[PDB]
Amino acid sequence: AVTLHLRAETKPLEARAALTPTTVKKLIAKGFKIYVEDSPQSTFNINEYRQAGAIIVPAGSWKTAPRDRIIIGLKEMPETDTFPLVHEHIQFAHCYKDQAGWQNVLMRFIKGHGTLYDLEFLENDQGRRVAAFGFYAGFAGAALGVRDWAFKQTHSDDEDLPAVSPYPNEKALVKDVTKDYKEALATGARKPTVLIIGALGRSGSGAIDLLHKVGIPDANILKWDIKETSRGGPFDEIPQADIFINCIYLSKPIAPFTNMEKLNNPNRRLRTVVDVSADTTNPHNPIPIYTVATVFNKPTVLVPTTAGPKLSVISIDHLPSLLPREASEFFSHDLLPSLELLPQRKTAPVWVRAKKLFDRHCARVKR
Numbered sequence: 001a002v003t004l005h006l007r008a009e010t011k012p013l014e015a016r017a018a019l020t021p022t023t024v025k026k027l028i029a030k031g032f033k034i035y036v037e038d039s040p041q042s043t044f045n046i047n048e049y050r051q052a053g054a055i056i057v058p059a060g061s062w063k064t065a066p067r068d069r070i071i072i073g074l075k076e077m078p079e080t081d082t083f084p085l086v087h088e089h090i091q092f093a094h095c096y097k098d099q100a101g102w103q104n105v106l107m108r109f110i111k112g113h114g115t116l117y118d119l120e121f122l123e124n125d126q127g128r129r130v131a132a133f134g135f136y137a138g139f140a141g142a143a144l145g146v147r148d149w150a151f152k153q154t155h156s157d158d159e160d161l162p163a164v165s166p167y168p169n170e171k172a173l174v175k176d177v178t179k180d181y182k183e184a185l186a187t188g189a190r191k192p193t194v195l196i197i198g199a200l201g202r203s204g205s206g207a208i209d210l211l212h213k214v215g216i217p218d219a220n221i222l223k224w225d226i227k228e229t230s231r232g233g234p235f236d237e238i239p240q241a242d243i244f245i246n247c248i249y250l251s252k253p254i255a256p257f258t259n260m261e262k263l264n265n266p267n268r269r270l271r272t273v274v275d276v277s278a279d280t281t282n283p284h285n286p287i288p289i290y291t292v293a294t295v296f297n298k299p300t301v302l303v304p305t306t307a308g309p310k311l312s313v314i315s316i317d318h319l320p321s322l323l324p325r326e327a328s329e330f331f332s333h334d335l336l337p338s339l340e341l342l343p344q345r346k347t348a349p350v351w352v353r354a355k356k357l358f359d360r361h362c363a364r365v366k367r
């Protein structure tokens with residue numbers, strides 16, 4: 001049989017779960033044994049998992065679980081966990097693109113003889129991702145960006161966009177954003193132009209979807225992707241946009257989309273940068289204008305400019321947790337076919353590809 005163990009998330013404010021109660025109920029009917037840690041931050045009630053058939057165990061009991069259990073979780077391990085990782089782990093580890101500290105992430109697996117099957121690199125035969133939160137991120141990102149832009153029209157510069165909390169549904173999020181937005185227009189603010197780079201992807205789509213729902217007109221949205229950026233940055237259309245939303249998948253080293261020089265300019269219209277891609281700790285980050293990773297409880301950081309109006313960056317790295325329950329159901333449904341193959345993970349290509357990718361990255365690590 002396969003035994004799975006759903007780890008309680010420890011990333012602050014992370015409310016999503018990698019397996020939902022439905023997903024657990026379906027896996028049990030397929031013969032899996034499933035443990036679920038009682039999580040204080042999860043949007044799901046522990047009783048939904050009880051009724052699904054999960055064995056309920058305490059938060060962080062994965063650490064002492066039998067070595068045959070596959071530990072599944074969404075987000076990073078705490079930096080302060082330094083002991084060897086001995087299980088097979090399914091999670092997002094963000095350590096295959098030379099993010100700051102990537103060697104330390106992998107070294108725990110190397111010392112424990114564990115295996116990382118990274119959620120981002122689970123792909124079908126045709127090179128496409130099997131499960132992805134991108135749409136919910138571009139959506140949530142675009143919502144906070146429009147909210148920030150609107151705030152800057154109706155509030156003192158002294159003030160920053162206040163803490164956000166997760167929403168019970170998209171309708172309620174769109175209602176908040178639409179209020180702030182109409183309120184700013186009512187006072188004479190010009191309808192914003194929004195520049196989206198990576199517009200054709202998952203998060204680009206979610207961001208266009210939000211902008212439509214809130215009532216920004218198609219003409220006001222510049223939808224850029226690889227065509228439009230082949231000339232290479234930095235670009236002039238960024239400082240002249242009202243809102244810039246970065247939705248690229250950064251894979252190759254590229255010329256930065258803008259810089260401090262271009263932004264220090266009295267005639268800059270740009271008020272809000274939504275860095276959805278959020279390759280903040282990447283050495284090739286094509287948005288080197290900030291260094292802070294913002295969080296729901298403090299969602300914007302000031303980009304200190306020497307000319308032009310107050311500009312802020314949003315760089316929350318788990319935007320989909322603004323809408324935790326449906327984001328989780330969406331992702332787990334799309335993940336399920338792969339998880340059903342875990343009994344055969346030694347031969348199933350989706351799993352094997354991911355194991356071989358892990359071994360090649362571990363080979364790059366200094367010993």
Ligand SMILES: NC(=O)C1=CN([C@@H]2O[C@H](COP(=O)(O)OP(=O)(O)OC[C@H]3O[C@@H](n4cnc5c(N)ncnc54)[C@H](O)[C@@H]3O)[C@@H](O)[C@H]2O)C=CC1
Nearest residue numbers: 134137198200201202203225226229248249277317318319
């Ligand atoms: N902040 C958060 O909570 C989240 C962040 N993300 C991040 O978003 C990034 C993209 O995710 P997805 O939308 O699923 O990827 P995706 O692969 O669906 O779309 C990426 C788009 O960027 C375009 N692109 C790539 N390089 C470009 C360039 N140099 N110039 C212009 N366009 C370029 C591609 O053609 C593609 O259409 C990921 O790296 C992911 O880590 C995703 C989910 C949540």
Ligand SMILES: N[C@@H](CCCCN[C@@H](CCC(=O)O)C(=O)O)C(=O)O
Nearest residue numbers: 094132133134277278279317318320
């Ligand atoms: N682009 C960065 C990471 C951005 C943060 C991603 N967090 C997302 C991932 C979801 C997905 O890709 O499906 C999240 O939803 O927690 C990197 O490559 O290191």
